Amino acid sequence: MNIFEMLRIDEGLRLKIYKDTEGYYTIGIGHLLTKSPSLNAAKSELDKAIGRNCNGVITKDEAEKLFNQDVDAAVRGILRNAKLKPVYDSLDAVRRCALINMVFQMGETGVAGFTNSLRMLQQKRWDEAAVNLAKSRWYNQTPNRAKRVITSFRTGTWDAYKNL
C-alpha cells in the first residue's frame, strides 16, 4: 500500500462534477474545484484546471493527472510548513502517509491547527494522539475515513486499509 492507493480508497474516483461531503463541487479523486455554490463557477474552474472545454466531464487520465498534482502539492506544503515539517520528519513511513492524507483532505492550515495532537505525534504517544484526534469536527463529520487515518497513526500499519 502507498499514499496513492490509500487516498484512492478514501476519496473514490468520479469523472463527472459532484458535491463532496461538505456540499462542494469536486471532480476526480477528491479534487476540490470551488467552494462556490455555482455549478457554473465549478465548470469554469474545471476547464481552467484541465486546459480544455470539459463540459463538467473528464477522462480517467485527467483525473489521475490532477491527483498526481494534488499529492505533490500536499507533500510540498507539509515540507514548507513550519508546524508540519518537524512532525513529518519525526514520523515513520506509514504515519507519514496518514499526515499526508489529512493535509490532502483538510489543507495545511486546517491540519496545522491540530496543535495538541501534532505535539503528541511528535512525542510518539500513539494512543494519546488517537484519542485527541477523535475530538474534532473532522471525526464527527467523516467518522469512517477519520477512524482509518487514526488507526494508521495509532498502529503504524496499513491494517485499516487491508480490508478495503
Cα dihedral 61, 77, 89, 141 sign:
negative
H and E: helices and strands count for the chain: 9, 3
Cα dihedral 125, 130, 131, 133 sign:
positive
Catalytic one of 5, 10, 20, 64 = 20
Considering the domain delimited by 1-164, tell me its CATH architecture.
Orthogonal Bundle (1.10)
The set of long-range contacts for 123-132, using a CB threshold of 8 Å and a minimum separation of 24, is: 124/90, 126/153, 126/154, 126/155, 126/156, 127/154, 129/153, 129/154, 130/154
* Binding-site residue ranges: 32, 104, 117, 132
CA distance 94 to 23: 30
Spatial contact of 94 and 59, defined as CB atoms under 8 Å apart: no
CA distance 31 to 75: 15
Catalytic one of 5, 10, 11, 92 = 11
Elucidation method: X-ray
Q: Partners of 27 in the beta sheet?
A: 31
Spatial contact of 130 and 150, defined as CB atoms under 8 Å apart: yes
Backbone φ and ψ for 56, nearest 5 degrees, come out as 75, 10
Q: Mark whether 11 is an active-site residue.
A: yes
Which triple of cell numbers denotes residue 38?
455555482
Expressed in angstroms, the distance from the first to the final Cα of the chain is: 11
CA distance 40 to 20: 16
What does the domain layout of the chain look like in residue ranges?
1-164
Q: Mark whether 127 is an active-site residue.
A: no
For 34-60, give one letter per residue: b (16+ CB within 10 A) or e.
beeeeeeebbebbeebbeeebebebee
* Binding-site residue ranges for substrate: 32, 104, 117, 132
